[PDB]
Every structure is written in C-alpha cells, then in structure tokens.
Amino acid sequence: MEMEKEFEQIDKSGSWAAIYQDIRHEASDFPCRVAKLPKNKNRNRYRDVSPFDHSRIKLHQEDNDYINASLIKMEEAQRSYILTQGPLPNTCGHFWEMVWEQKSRGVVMLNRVMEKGSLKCAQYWPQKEEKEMIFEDTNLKLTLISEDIKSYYTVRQLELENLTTQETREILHFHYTTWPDFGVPESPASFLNFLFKVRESGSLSPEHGPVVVHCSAGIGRSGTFCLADTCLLLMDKRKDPSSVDIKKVLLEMRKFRMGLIQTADQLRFSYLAVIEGAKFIMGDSSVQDQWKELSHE
Ligand SMILES: O=C1CN(c2ccccc2)S(=O)(=O)N1
C-alpha cells in the first residue's frame, strides 16, 4: 500500500516531525466567533481549543445554543462524527442534551477523569446503578444499566430519558482507560480491538445520529480515533488500500475542527493502526481474534 511505502520512507529518514508540522501549516483556518463570546467563557475547557462557527453543534434552546463540539462530516467516506471536549461541571447537562438532540447511540471516551494529577473531565455519567443522575437545566435523566469491565477499557449500557417527553434511549459508553494525554495506545492491536468493538455495536452506523467522541480537549486522541476509522472505511468501500492518502484525509477532517492529532507520534501511530487494520478489510477474518489476544483484554 502507498501508505506503507511512505511509512518506511518517513521512518527511515526520521522525518515525522517535519511531516506533521507541514500538516499543521496547511491546516484550514476558520472563524470561532461564537466560542469566543464572553458569555461562553465558562463553557470552554481550553482557551486555545474552540469549534469553528461553520461546523459547531447547536443546542436546541433559545437561551444559549453553544457547546464546544464540532460535526465532522466525511462526505467521501459517508460517516459523521461529533468531536467534543471533556464536559465541565457546568456543561454535563448540555452534553447529554446534545446526545439526545443529535440522536447519537454511542459515546467514545478516550481519557480518564484524572490524568497527570489534574481533572481532565467531569464525572458526567453514573458509576452505580442505584444512583442515577438528573440534569435539571436540560431536563434529562441518566441511569447505569450495566457495564463490562475489561483490561484497558470498559463498556457501559446507559439509559437516557427525556423527562419532558418521557422517551427512553439506550446509550453505549465506550471508555478507553489506558491512552495517555499526548500519548499513543499500547499497540495498534489494542487500539483496533477497541475500535472494532465500537463498530460491532452499531454506534457508528448511518441509521443512528453521529457517534460522540471525546478525550480532554477533543482533538488529539479523538482525532486519532476518527482518522483511523475513516481511512479504514474508505479503503473498505473501494476494497483498495492504495487509494487512501492518510494526510489528505486528516486535512479534510481539519476543515471541521482544529488541531486534530496533537503530536507527530500520534500521526505515526495512525499509519500503524490503518496499515494493520487493512489486514481485516482485505479478507483476513482471523486477525480480529489475533488483536483480541495481543490486546491482553
Ligand atoms: O492527546 C491529546 C492531547 N490533547 C490536548 C490538546 C490541547 C490542550 C490539552 C490537551 S487531547 O485531550 O485532545 N488528546
């Protein structure tokens, strides 16, 4: 595959930093006016990470429709994702409101509530079934139905209810717990095992709203996850891994949200995951169980 040759080429000349910095230089620049309004200062976790006005998700409420989230619509691949920051103590209600209004089925969390001794995300979901959460502001109820804890990730079945209409929906929460901030997965096997788990749940299917993906800022780890998934989907459509230009795809994604993929090594890891994942797309069913093994699930 073209990417495989390119990989060795860059790896040989050890120029990932140069390749990565080039993408940053070419990346799109669009207005983030709403995000910067004074009334929204307390709705942003990082002053330097904001959603573009053109692709930001709007909450369905007259008061304030702002939430730090972006709709990444990949027209070519035919899949959309909503990338957002880890919710703040005051935006947990906004977060579930977004999940409801956008009709999402799954939520992918790639960070931990606490990392490097600091709080990177609010405890926005219930940890015990007996203690449901109620969000007054958005009038939503959230209950833990069950959870399947594994070595490095946990899958929870949640029940989201619109207290206004009393409708109920099943939300699946996929939590990757071993992906360090500004870091990379333990191995592509571990990452791919997790991605396919999300895929097998139907959370990424077009019959549901876009899956919600987030880490702390919603650009680094979240970008890596989406880049890998989109690239695998593309070569799957054509059944031709050579037709995928990883850098072009990343640049296309960056038209919807700034700074996707935060380090040169996260870019390098992306190449590894996609090249590895190609094995499955090309008809090798056995590698999935191979990944499950190596992942030390
Ligand atoms: O790897 C990373 C680095 N991130 C980040 C990006 C900007 C500020 C703070 C943290 S992320 O939470 O988007 N994932």
Backbone angles phi, psi at 175, to 5 degrees: -110, 110
49 lines ligand 1 (CB under 6 A): yes
Which amino acid is present at 35?
A
> In angstroms, what CA-CA distances link 173 with 27, 50, 160?
31, 24, 12
The Cα–Cα gap between 153 and 190 comes to 10
Tokens 């396919």 map to which residue?
A: 196
> DSSP strand E in the chain: where?
69-74, 79-84, 106-109, 114-115, 118-119, 133-135, 140-149, 153-162, 167-176, 211-214
Q: Which residue has the least CA distance to atom 6 on ligand 1?
A: 217
215 catalytic per annotation: yes
φ/ψ of 73, rounded to 5, equals: -100, 105
Residue 293, token pair as written in the block = 């093994």
Residue of 217, 239, 236 whose CA lies nearest to 228: 236
In single-letter form, the type of residue at position 83 comes to L
Residue type at 109? M
Question: The tokens of 103 are what?
Answer: 């009709």
Distance, in Å, from the CA atom of 185 to the CA atom of 105, rounded to the nearest integer, reads: 24
Neighbours of 170 (CB within 10 A): 11
**In terms of Cα–Cα distance, which of 239, 245, 252 is closest to 2?**
245
268: tokens are 């390098």
Distance separating alpha carbons of residues 227 and 231, to the nearest angstrom: 6
User: 168 C-alpha to center of ligand 1: Å?
Assistant: 33
Q: What is the resolution of this structure in A?
A: 1.8
Beta-carbon contacts of residue 40 (< 8 Å; ≥ 6 apart): 34, 64, 66
What span, in angstroms and rounded, lies between the C-alpha atoms of 276 and 186?
A: 14
Separation between Cα atoms, residue 143 and residue 158, nearest integer Å: 6
Q: Please, what sign has the CA dihedral across residues 248, 83, 115, 291?
A: negative
* 155, β-bridge pairs: 148, 174
Q: Are 77 and 237 in contact (CB under 8 A)?
A: yes
DSSP 125: S
Q: Residue ranges for the binding site for substrate?
A: 181, 215-221, 262
Retrieve residue 104's tokens.
Answer: 């999402």
DSSP state of 43: G
Q: Is the CB of 244 under 6 A from ligand 1?
A: no
- What 3-state DSSP class applies to 17? helix
Residue whose CA is at the smallest distance from ligand 1 atom 8? 217
Question: What topology does CATH give the domain 1-297?
Answer: Protein-Tyrosine Phosphatase; Chain A (3.90.190)
Distance from C-alpha of 195 to C-alpha of 211, rounded to nearest angstrom? 12
Q: What contacts 114, CB < 8 A, 6 or more positions away?
A: 120
Q: Which two tokens stand for residue 247?
A: 């850098």
Residue 137 parent element (H or E): none
Q: What are phi and psi of 167, to 5 degrees?
A: -75, 155
Full 3-state SS string of 165-231: CCEEEEEEEEEECCCCCCCCCCCHHHHHHHHHHHHHCCCCCCCCCCEEEECCCCCCHHHHHHHHHHH
